[PDB]
């Protein structure tokens, strides 16, 4: 029925303005109230603000009021951003009801959400990953090996094994942001101990935003 799709720059530097927009179709934009909600990694959902389609009347979260601007598609501008503003940003319709018997209104609940656009606030520059082998085995029947893929920015990297012919038993962990401002993850795989010494295990690491491709043989130390 209603369709929401938000867009914006995936990267913003600290102290700059974060700007996101939302394209809405399927209904009369004028008669409804539209707004923004975010979720920072590891945090809960946080309402930013909601505005009336027809008149651009609306309210913001008091904690974000000072640096927030919502205009009518609708647009969001968040000034003076910091690392904490790193989040997924969702467009939404806000519904409300009379609390009366009285002039009091409820605040908003949200019956349609967009897929959400991720935005990261960071001072880091684009940088290719380092790739280090994770090597141990013939005592146990199954061995583990991997590749540590670190010190890159921004996300994502992809990892495959033996040009994608090895898939069973692969685990590629989510990336973690290090204090340095660069990301790190490992990819691991379990294989028969008996295969070490006749089979070669190679991790193929891709990092598109730096146009980096790495092949790394993982040998027994």
């Amino acid at each position: 029925q209603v369709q929401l799709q938000e867009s914006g720059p995936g990267l913003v530097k600290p102290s700059e303005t974060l700007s996101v927009t939302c394209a809405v179709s399927g209904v009369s934009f004028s008669s409804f109230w539209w707004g923004w909600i975010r979720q920072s990694p590891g945090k809960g959902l946080e309402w930013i603000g909601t505005i009336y389609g027809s008149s651009g009347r609306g309210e913001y979260n008091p904690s974000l009021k000072s640096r927030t601007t919502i205009s009518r598609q609708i647009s969001l501008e968040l000034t003076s951003v910091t690392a904490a503003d790193t989040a997924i940003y969702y467009c939404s319709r806000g519904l409300f009801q009379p609390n009366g018997f009285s002039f009091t209104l409820t605040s908003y609940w949200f019956d349609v959400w967009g897929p959400g656009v991720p935005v990261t606030v960071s001072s880091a520059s684009t940088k290719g990953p380092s790739v280090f082998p994770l090597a141990p085995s013939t005592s146990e029947s199954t061995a583990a090996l991997g590749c540590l893929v670190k010190d890159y920015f921004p996300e994502p990297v992809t990892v495959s094994w033996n040009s994608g012919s090895l898939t069973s038993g692969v685990h590629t962990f989510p990336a973690v942001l290090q204090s340095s401002g660069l990301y790190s993850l490992s990819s691991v795989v379990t294989v028969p101990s008996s295969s070490l010494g006749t089979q070669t295990y190679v991790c193929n690491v891709n990092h598109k935003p730096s146009n980096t491709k790495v092949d790394k043989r993982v040998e027994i130390k």
């Binding site: 809960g44 309402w47 605040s107 609940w109 959400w113 280090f132 991997g146």
Partner: protein, 213 residues
């Protein structure tokens, strides 16, 4: 802000179960509570509003109840598509605020982790910064504790954990614990060990290496 508190943070369940999750607020909100369902990387979906009204299209096995400061979401006969994270949200007053969620995950038999430790490669040592990786593979349930010991002494700080989503095929988790040290620090100890505690283990398991051996 009105504080919204959800419990439990996680529940394990099976298809066919009836599950109950709770939402409590710091002051009365009448019946102005909404419930949402979120699957990884997907847009949230409204399930319930005004505490008990089912949104358009939502299946009837979902039911909301409560008023004031105490609310409940009940899922009668859980189905495969219902494994997800659920959030509640108050909207009696500004700002609307959300609970931190309840994850409903798939129950399976207990499985101990297989533990592996990986010393830093020589070329990481040369860089001056080393990462020591401990791997916990294919375990259940999620709860697991890893302790790092250096020459038999507890090492706190300088570690980060990362976990996979529940595996689609065997419903297990895997986890890495990565200890990051300057090489100067790394060279000042001889044995590195990660000690793993988990329900599937009757006693803690330790995997270790001697640096430079």
């Amino acid at each position: 802000d009105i504080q919204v508190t959800q419990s439990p943070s996680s529940l394990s369940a099976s298809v066919g179960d009836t599950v109950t999750i709770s939402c409590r607020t710091s002051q009365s909100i009448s019946t102005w509570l909404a419930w949402y369902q979120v699957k990884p990387g997907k847009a949230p979906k409204l399930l319930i509003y005004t505490a008990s009204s089912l949104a358009s299209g939502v299946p009837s096995r979902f039911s909301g109840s409560g008023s004031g400061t105490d609310f409940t979401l009940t899922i009668s006969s859980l189905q495969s598509e219902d494994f997800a994270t659920y959030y509640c949200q108050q909207y009696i007053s500004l700002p609307p605020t959300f609970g931190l969620g309840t994850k409903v995950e798939i129950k399976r038999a207990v499985a101990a982790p297989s533990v592996f430790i990986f010393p830093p490669s020589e070329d990481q040592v040369k860089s001056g910064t080393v990462s020591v990786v401990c791997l916990l593979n294919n375990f259940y349930p999620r709860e697991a504790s890893v302790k790092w010991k250096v020459d038999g002494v507890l090492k706190t700080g300088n570690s980060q954990e990362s976990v996979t989503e529940q595996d689609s095929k065997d419903n297990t988790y895997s986890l890495s614990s990565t200890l990051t040290l300057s090489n100067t620090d790394y060279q000042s100890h001889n044995v590195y060990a990660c000690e793993v505690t988990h329900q599937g283990l009757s006693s803690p398991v330790t995997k270790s290496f001697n640096r430079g051996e």
